Amino acid sequence: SISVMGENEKPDVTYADVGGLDMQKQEIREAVELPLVQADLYEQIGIDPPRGVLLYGPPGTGKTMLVKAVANSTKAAFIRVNGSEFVHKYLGEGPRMVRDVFRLARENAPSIIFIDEVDSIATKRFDAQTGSDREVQRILIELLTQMDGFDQSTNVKVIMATNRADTLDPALLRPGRLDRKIEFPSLRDRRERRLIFGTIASKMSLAPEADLDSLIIRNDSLSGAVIAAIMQEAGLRAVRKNRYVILQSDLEEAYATQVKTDNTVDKFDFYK
Amino acid sequence: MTDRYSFSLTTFSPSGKLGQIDYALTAVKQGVTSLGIKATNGVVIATEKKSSSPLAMSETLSKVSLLTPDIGAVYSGMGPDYRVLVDKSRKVAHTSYKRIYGEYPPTKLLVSEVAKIMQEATQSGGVRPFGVSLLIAGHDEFNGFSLYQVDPSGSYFPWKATAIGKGSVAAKTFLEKRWNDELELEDAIHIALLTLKESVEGEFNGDTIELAIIGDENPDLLGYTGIPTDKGPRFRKLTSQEINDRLEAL
Amino acid sequence: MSGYDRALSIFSPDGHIFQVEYALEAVKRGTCAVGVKGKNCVVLGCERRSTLKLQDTRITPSKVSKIDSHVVLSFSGLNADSRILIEKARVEAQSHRLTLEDPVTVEYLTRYVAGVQQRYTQSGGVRPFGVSTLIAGFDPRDDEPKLYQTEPSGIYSSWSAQTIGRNSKTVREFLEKNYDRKEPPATVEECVKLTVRSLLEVVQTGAKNIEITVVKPDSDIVALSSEEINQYVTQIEQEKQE
Amino acid sequence: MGSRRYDSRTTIFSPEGRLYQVEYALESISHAGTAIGIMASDGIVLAAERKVTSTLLEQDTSTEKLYKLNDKIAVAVAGLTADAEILINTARIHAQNYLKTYNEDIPVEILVRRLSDIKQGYTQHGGLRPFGVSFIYAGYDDRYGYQLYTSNPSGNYTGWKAISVGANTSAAQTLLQMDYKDDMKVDDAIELALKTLSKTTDSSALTYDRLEFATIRKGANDGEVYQKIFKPQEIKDILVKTGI
Amino acid sequence: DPLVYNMTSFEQGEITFDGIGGLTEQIRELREVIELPLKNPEIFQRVGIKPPKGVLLYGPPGTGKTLLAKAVAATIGANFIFSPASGIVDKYIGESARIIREMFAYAKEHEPCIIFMDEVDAIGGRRFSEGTSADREIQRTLMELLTQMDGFDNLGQTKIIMATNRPDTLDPALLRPGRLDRKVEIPLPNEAGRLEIFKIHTAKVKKTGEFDFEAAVKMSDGFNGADIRNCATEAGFFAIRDDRDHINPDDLMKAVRKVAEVKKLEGTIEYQK
Amino acid sequence: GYDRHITIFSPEGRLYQVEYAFKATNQTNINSLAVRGKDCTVVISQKKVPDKLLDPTTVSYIFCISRTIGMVVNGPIPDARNAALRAKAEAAEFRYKYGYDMPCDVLAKRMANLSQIYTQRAYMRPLGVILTFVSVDEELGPSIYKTDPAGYYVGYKATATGPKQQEITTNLENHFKKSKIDHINEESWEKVVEFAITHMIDALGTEFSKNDLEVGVATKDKFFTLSAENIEERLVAI
Amino acid sequence: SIGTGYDLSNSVFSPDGRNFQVEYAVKAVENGTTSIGIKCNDGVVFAVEKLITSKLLVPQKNVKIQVVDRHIGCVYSGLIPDGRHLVNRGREEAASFKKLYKTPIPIPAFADRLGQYVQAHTLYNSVRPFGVSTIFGGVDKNGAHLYMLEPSGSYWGYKGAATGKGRQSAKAELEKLVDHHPEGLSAREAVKQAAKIIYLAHEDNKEKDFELEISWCSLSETNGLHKFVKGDLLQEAIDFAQKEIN
Numbered sequence A: 001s002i003s004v005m006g007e008n009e010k011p012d013v014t015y016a017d018v019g020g021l022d023m024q025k026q027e028i029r030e031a032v033e034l035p036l037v038q039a040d041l042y043e044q045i046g047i048d049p050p051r052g053v054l055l056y057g058p059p060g061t062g063k064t065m066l067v068k069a070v071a072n073s074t075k076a077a078f079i080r081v082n083g084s085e086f087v088h089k090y091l092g093e094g095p096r097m098v099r100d101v102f103r104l105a106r107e108n109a110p111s112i113i114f115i116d117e118v119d120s121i122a123t124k125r126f127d128a129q130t131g132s133d134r135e136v137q138r139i140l141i142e143l144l145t146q147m148d149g150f151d152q153s154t155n156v157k158v159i160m161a162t163n164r165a166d167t168l169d170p171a172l173l174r175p176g177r178l179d180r181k182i183e184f185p186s187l188r189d190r191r192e193r194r195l196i197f198g199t200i201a202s203k204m205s206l207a208p209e210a211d212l213d214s215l216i217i218r219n220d221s222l223s224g225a226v227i228a229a230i231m232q233e234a235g236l237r238a239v240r241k242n243r244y245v246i247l248q249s250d251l252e253e254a255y256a257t258q259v260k261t262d263n264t265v266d267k268f269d270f271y272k
Numbered sequence B: 001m002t003d004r005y006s007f008s009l010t011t012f013s014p015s016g017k018l019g020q021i022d023y024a025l026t027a028v029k030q031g032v033t034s035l036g037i038k039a040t041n042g043v044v045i046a047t048e049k050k051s052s053s054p055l056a057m058s059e060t061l062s063k064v065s066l067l068t069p070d071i072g073a074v075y076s077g078m079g080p081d082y083r084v085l086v087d088k089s090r091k092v093a094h095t096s097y098k099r100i101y102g103e104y105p106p107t108k109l110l111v112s113e114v115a116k117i118m119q120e121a122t123q124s125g126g127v128r129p130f131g132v133s134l135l136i137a138g139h140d141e142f143n144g145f146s147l148y149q150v151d152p153s154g155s156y157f158p159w160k161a162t163a164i165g166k167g168s169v170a171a172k173t174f175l176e177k178r179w180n181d182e183l184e185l186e187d188a189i190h191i192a193l194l195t196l197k198e199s200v201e202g203e204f205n206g207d208t209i210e211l212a213i214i215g216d217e218n219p220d221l222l223g224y225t226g227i228p229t230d231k232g233p234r235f236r237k238l239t240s241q242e243i244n245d246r247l248e249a250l
Numbered sequence C: 001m002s003g004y005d006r007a008l009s010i011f012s013p014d015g016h017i018f019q020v021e022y023a024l025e026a027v028k029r030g031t032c033a034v035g036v037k038g039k040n041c042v043v044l045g046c047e048r049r050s051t052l053k054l055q056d057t058r059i060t061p062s063k064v065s066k067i068d069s070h071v072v073l074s075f076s077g078l079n080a081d082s083r084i085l086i087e088k089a090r091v092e093a094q095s096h097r098l099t100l101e102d103p104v105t106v107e108y109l110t111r112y113v114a115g116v117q118q119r120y121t122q123s124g125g126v127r128p129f130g131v132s133t134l135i136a137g138f139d140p141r142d143d144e145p146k147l148y149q150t151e152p153s154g155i156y157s158s159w160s161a162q163t164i165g166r167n168s169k170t171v172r173e174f175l176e177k178n179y180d181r182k183e184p185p186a187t188v189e190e191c192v193k194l195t196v197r198s199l200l201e202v203v204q205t206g207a208k209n210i211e212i213t214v215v216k217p218d219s220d221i222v223a224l225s226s227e228e229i230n231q232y233v234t235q236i237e238q239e240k241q242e
Numbered sequence D: 001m002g003s004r005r006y007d008s009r010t011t012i013f014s015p016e017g018r019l020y021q022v023e024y025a026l027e028s029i030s031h032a033g034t035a036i037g038i039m040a041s042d043g044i045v046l047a048a049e050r051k052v053t054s055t056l057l058e059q060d061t062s063t064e065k066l067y068k069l070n071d072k073i074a075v076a077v078a079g080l081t082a083d084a085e086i087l088i089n090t091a092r093i094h095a096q097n098y099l100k101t102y103n104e105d106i107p108v109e110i111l112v113r114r115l116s117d118i119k120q121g122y123t124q125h126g127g128l129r130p131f132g133v134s135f136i137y138a139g140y141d142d143r144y145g146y147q148l149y150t151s152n153p154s155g156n157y158t159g160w161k162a163i164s165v166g167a168n169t170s171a172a173q174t175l176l177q178m179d180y181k182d183d184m185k186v187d188d189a190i191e192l193a194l195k196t197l198s199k200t201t202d203s204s205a206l207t208y209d210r211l212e213f214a215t216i217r218k219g220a221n222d223g224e225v226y227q228k229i230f231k232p233q234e235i236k237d238i239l240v241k242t243g244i
Numbered sequence E: 001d002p003l004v005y006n007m008t009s010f011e012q013g014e015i016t017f018d019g020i021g022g023l024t025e026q027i028r029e030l031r032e033v034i035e036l037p038l039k040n041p042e043i044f045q046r047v048g049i050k051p052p053k054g055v056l057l058y059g060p061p062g063t064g065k066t067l068l069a070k071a072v073a074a075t076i077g078a079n080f081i082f083s084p085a086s087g088i089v090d091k092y093i094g095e096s097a098r099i100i101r102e103m104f105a106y107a108k109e110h111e112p113c114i115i116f117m118d119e120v121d122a123i124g125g126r127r128f129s130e131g132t133s134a135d136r137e138i139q140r141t142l143m144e145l146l147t148q149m150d151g152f153d154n155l156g157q158t159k160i161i162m163a164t165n166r167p168d169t170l171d172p173a174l175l176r177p178g179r180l181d182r183k184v185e186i187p188l189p190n191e192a193g194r195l196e197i198f199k200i201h202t203a204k205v206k207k208t209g210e211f212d213f214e215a216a217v218k219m220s221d222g223f224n225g226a227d228i229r230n231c232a233t234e235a236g237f238f239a240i241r242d243d244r245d246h247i248n249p250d251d252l253m254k255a256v257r258k259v260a261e262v263k264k265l266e267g268t269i270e271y272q273k
Numbered sequence F: 001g002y003d004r005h006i007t008i009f010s011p012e013g014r015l016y017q018v019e020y021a022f023k024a025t026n027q028t029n030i031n032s033l034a035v036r037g038k039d040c041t042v043v044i045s046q047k048k049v050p051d052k053l054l055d056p057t058t059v060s061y062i063f064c065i066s067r068t069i070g071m072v073v074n075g076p077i078p079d080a081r082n083a084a085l086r087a088k089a090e091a092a093e094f095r096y097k098y099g100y101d102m103p104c105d106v107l108a109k110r111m112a113n114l115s116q117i118y119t120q121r122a123y124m125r126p127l128g129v130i131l132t133f134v135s136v137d138e139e140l141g142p143s144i145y146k147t148d149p150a151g152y153y154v155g156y157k158a159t160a161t162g163p164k165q166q167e168i169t170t171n172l173e174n175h176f177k178k179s180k181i182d183h184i185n186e187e188s189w190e191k192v193v194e195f196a197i198t199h200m201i202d203a204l205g206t207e208f209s210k211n212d213l214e215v216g217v218a219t220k221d222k223f224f225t226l227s228a229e230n231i232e233e234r235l236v237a238i
Numbered sequence G: 001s002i003g004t005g006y007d008l009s010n011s012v013f014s015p016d017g018r019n020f021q022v023e024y025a026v027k028a029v030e031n032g033t034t035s036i037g038i039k040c041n042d043g044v045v046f047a048v049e050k051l052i053t054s055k056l057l058v059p060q061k062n063v064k065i066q067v068v069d070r071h072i073g074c075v076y077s078g079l080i081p082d083g084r085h086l087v088n089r090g091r092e093e094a095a096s097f098k099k100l101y102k103t104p105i106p107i108p109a110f111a112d113r114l115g116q117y118v119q120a121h122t123l124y125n126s127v128r129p130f131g132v133s134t135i136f137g138g139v140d141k142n143g144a145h146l147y148m149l150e151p152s153g154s155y156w157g158y159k160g161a162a163t164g165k166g167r168q169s170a171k172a173e174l175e176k177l178v179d180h181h182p183e184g185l186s187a188r189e190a191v192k193q194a195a196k197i198i199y200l201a202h203e204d205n206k207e208k209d210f211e212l213e214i215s216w217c218s219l220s221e222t223n224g225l226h227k228f229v230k231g232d233l234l235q236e237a238i239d240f241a242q243k244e245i246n
């Protein structure tokens, strides 16, 4: 039988230990826990609740993490599952593994589940000419009906996650199954980075005698996970010189440490 | 000797989309950025070179090039497959139109014959297409100022304000907002200029860039003064300080 | 493939040559046709596959196709290739009439256009003529009727009747039953009711679909009127009463 | 050389007895635009539904789904326009050759059996592709009066009454197969066109920029026909007279 | 499975850093990162770091990285496992990948303990839109790895290091820092960097002559980091074949000259950035 | 095809073949360099010699094609000479037809434009070479140009070539940012030579003879190699 | 270029920039007869191992040498007929030179022709390279020369030469000889110094006997023309070189 998690552990993070992406920090809320908590106010108008969603973007950008604080703030039952274990040696182990999880949800409902990655088991064609790659499609079809077949549940729906958002069927990507899609781009806009650096930085030791705008405006094409590395590495620009609290030039010594690898790969002999 | 009249590119894949064409313009998008737009009274084209190493001179390699005193063009794609066909192109304007009539050609049909340089190559035996999708700007009297894009197939479109290359889509997404139906020149070049600067890092030095226009005649350059039936060359590019003083404005 | 002898050249281990038997394996997908020679007349026939009543009725490019007053041609299958053989035959007619000061035979004609195809399948950088044709008409000042059938392999073989294209084997067995080298049909209308009747198995009584000429001595060539045809289409069906 | 330059797949057959490059080409067009052509008793028309409609794309100077041959014949092109400007350059001479030696204009049945016979010419000879194209025609004479034809990339031409090409067409015929009478004045023909095109395409909005068409008539009694391509303003007139 | 219960062979055994040359700074770039969490973890909490998780190597092969992959075992005394990125696949789908869950948990039940993983280019693809009927299997086998190191399942107090000879072709989603927070290249070193490596073999076996290196090593601008152990033995391999069992600097020369061209005839294939 | 011939690209949007032709240029582990002057230029090319049966007067990578012009090759020889020969034959045309001698720029507007034609019509493989030129023209002064298997010919302030055209340059561009001159002084055709040799040995640090190196200088109505005894004049420094 | 590769057809740069359809050839010539080329201080001299492959062969009947117009000696190796081909081009073009410029042919500009005709059989797809390793050396007002030939066209100017299955053997002596004679020998004496090679080189192939032939060209002995040598000269040599190697 598949598993479930309460308070043996948690991810041990928070909405406050994260920042930015704030418009995504509310679209997610109204789908999931507010319906679970605040029910009547929209049952004043009784429309069917929105339900589980998708969320994509380039690798990183918190595509996998944002769950973790809301997970900490769930007040319902919840899981720890990804995609590429549904497969099994035998044939019917797969689909049999997965029919019951909704029963497990329904046996413990109201609750919700999650997947960290799905693109392995979701593609456009439900390819045909091999005894193997149909048995994955059966794992796709079964949820595709258990999601929004007859009489599914009260719950919100299987929360996706990917690095890509075109490979997979529209039959799954349409209302009643994925009523919201979400992008997580970074873009290096200056409205937010001036926080989330500080968010990541305020939690950690920091010398109030130091530059900080030495790089923000200086760099404009950035992502969200790497940036921890520079102000991770900034500390490591210190202890190598057995310094116990950081200094201003650590970041400048770090600025090109993580990023500056612009372009040298066969420049002249690229195309011409 | 050369036993390979076997027609390359003549194999329609079953979907109906050709093979190398959709691969050829896979290059030009991987190529550098350019653009060129239009106004009521003048025209402009520009791009940037990316020397890629310091010591190499960056004024001999003229990416923009002349083909008539009233027409001028640029690309952004592959280089060496550009400078060969202009030499055919400008030769045509002497041959197909001038020697037989006397005049220089309009641009409703120079582009047509430049296209015919191209499709005769994607259809004969063992010949790749030219990895360029250039664009020309010219002036006439039945139609005056005008603009044209081409593509390595041969399909020429007309246009009003366009970019092609690396981040052209971002620029085509950019122009049309702050574009205007009567953006005359000295603001056109500005919006044109900044239309590139977003598309670039490294350095935006005045020497980094070339550009040019087709405006009004300038018989200070015509040299052979003493003939009222010899108008001025309507085409003329610009140097690297008169660009670099519209640039100090921003 | 200038030259290159792609697979037309490559014989088979069985002996055959692939692209040729392939050709007239493709020909049967096109409109049928038919020929007959009786006592004094010669007759031809084709069909029009059913359109939506838009296939332009006036100037349709038809199956019979004259050469002179005394020769015609019908064919089967491909059409863009048909139009050149019709040209580079009648070319030789106007030529043969000139440099010999007298017109063509038919045993001179089928030899040519059956020999031409052999050059379009025993040369390089050439595809065969995916087509099969027949010739029909008299020699000059002679009562004798002749038709010759020819096909892309290059062989020509005379006949008394024959059919080409689609569902011919559903047909020619009807003709060998009725038609016989014993004794022709008497005259024109005899051949036709015999001719038309043989089609009917693949016809769905589309009288519009089928189109007919005849050929007569002294080169009295003619095509016939849908009414004249349709009033055979019915009285022949009036005979169905059993 | 031969063993590795695949010059064999051209100009050869299937074992099931057919061609690939042509059934591909005939399909390859259907990704492209759309056009129609009919035959009114009074005169002739055409039309073309582009798809290239970027707003700043100039689409008002001249046209590309339509061309001319001479002062009495016109067409409606479909295909890729790198493979249209050549045979047309070989057509326009032909009239200026036919007149040049017989001082009259073309019996229009003759030239399509001069244009088709170069399209066929490549799909038998050489190892070359065909012209990936399909055409319409529209012309007038005296030994047949009015006419209308249709072609193919192989070289198989056909005379037809009222036709569509390109995309999504097999219903288009079936959308009009009821509506075609034979009386067919002109001004009860164009109503069919928009009634045709405005029920098949992307956006029923159908900006005039996304549309072209032409017309033929007999305006001078005992005189030639009036080739007239319509231009934006007068395109827009009938576009809104219908009330849409 | 029992196969996880077979790999662990020399989880401790110390072959220390004195037996290595050329890499006195990479190890300064690496003794930094690994041991410190596993020595003094409160520093990253003293200072406020999300600690690292993941490292790798790159550079051409036969170069000494696998030694480094084990030389850290000597410093720690703590545990270790060796394993490839090849002997994982099999017929039954998932069985290859299930193992990955079987093992990270197996780390958690006894540590300080870390992981090595060779030749990851086999599991180092860019996730393709189109595929074969089966090559996507490794991709779904991969992303479990892509998950488990940073997935929803939190992790701490274990480490992974991987290595290739082909850094390209990799799914960038792996290369997300957080999944590995520092890179490094081990090159073929300079002559002096090639010179400590030369003498360590003499440091063990019975030397007889003076140095006689600087001109010998003048030829050493061609070798790799690992052909010299062959070279070192190859001198005595036939110094003795004349039944002269006391070696010289006379005989290696015939060897070290020889190896270069037999190495040449199938050498310098590629370098992979 | 798509990885064997040239006249069909990859699916990606480039090709693979010609990218190799650049690579065989390094199939001789040779380095070269070239510089400027008010009236003078220099070119040099280190010379290897395996088995000593050769006639080192016969060995040469250099081909003074004409007066006013000079060139040296890279990569292998036999695929270079045919690129040199029609060059020499061409100057029997531009002169006989357009009056006077070829500038370099028209030449490296030409000798490349056909190398492009050798990669459309693939019957002739592209020439396995990158290639340079020198001269002392009359308008623009001592000019250098580079050429290549596909033709992004470029003028230069100086050059660098071999397997090690990354650091030899770095030993050169170090001070053309300092000295603030594309030009270089010490105009006479000797002093500029030591400049070429001192900065490279500073980048390499190896001693030489007349045996193993060479010379080539562009001068008015002149171009030639010579005797390299002036290796000595570096000696006076330290 | 191991299989599913590039070595099979010409003019396809293997990704290390090589024509592996070429370097198969130099093994062919390496699987052929031996021959040499030597620079006298006043001219040249050549040699070759003629190969008895049977008893029914006639001395001085079937040579393994051809010749240029008047002076330029030329030898073969590896495959003969492909060699014999371009030697017809050798005598050909030099007449086009002579008729035009009114003189005999210089040797450097000569290779400028013959070092391209073979190069121009490398670059197409529908041809084969000459599977040989030719030598030609001669004389002129500027002195004398010697030129070895490789199929890719990598011809240089040597003072001593070798080929065949006995190269590293033979050419060693040519190096071990010349250092003892920086003078540069005259003609008659280098002859026997070279026949020393072939009766030493054949040590590989002691299953059989053989014989040889000799060239000759110098200023003091022919006015600088090519020929062979007969009578007591080479007979005094073959026993001499055979005498001093036992």
Ligand SMILES: Nc1ncnc2c1ncn2[C@@H]1O[C@H](COP(=O)(O)OP(=O)(O)OP(=O)(O)O)[C@@H](O)[C@H]1O
Pocket (backbone or CB within 6 Å): A017, A018, A019, A020, A021, A058, A059, A060, A061, A062, A063, A064, A065, A066, A116, A117, A161, A162, A163, A196, A224, A225, A226, A228, E050, E150, E173, E176, E178
């Ligand atoms: N905006 C942010 N705020 C706080 N932390 C961030 C942010 N962006 C990135 N991070 C840090 O980078 C890491 C990002 O992990 P993330 O959830 O992006 O995994 P992921 O790569 O999206 O997963 P997958 O590859 O399955 O999409 C987190 O561990 C977090 O510490």
Ligand SMILES: Nc1ncnc2c1ncn2[C@@H]1O[C@H](COP(=O)(O)OP(=O)(O)O)[C@@H](O)[C@H]1O
Pocket (backbone or CB within 6 Å): E019, E020, E021, E022, E060, E061, E062, E063, E064, E065, E066, E067, E068, E197, E225, E226, E229
């Ligand atoms: N720096 C070095 N010091 C000592 N031995 C080395 C070194 N580099 C390589 N070797 C030799 O290489 C072999 C294995 O090295 P390894 O780490 O596997 O390199 P690679 O992974 O490139 O093969 C051992 O036999 C070892 O002696």
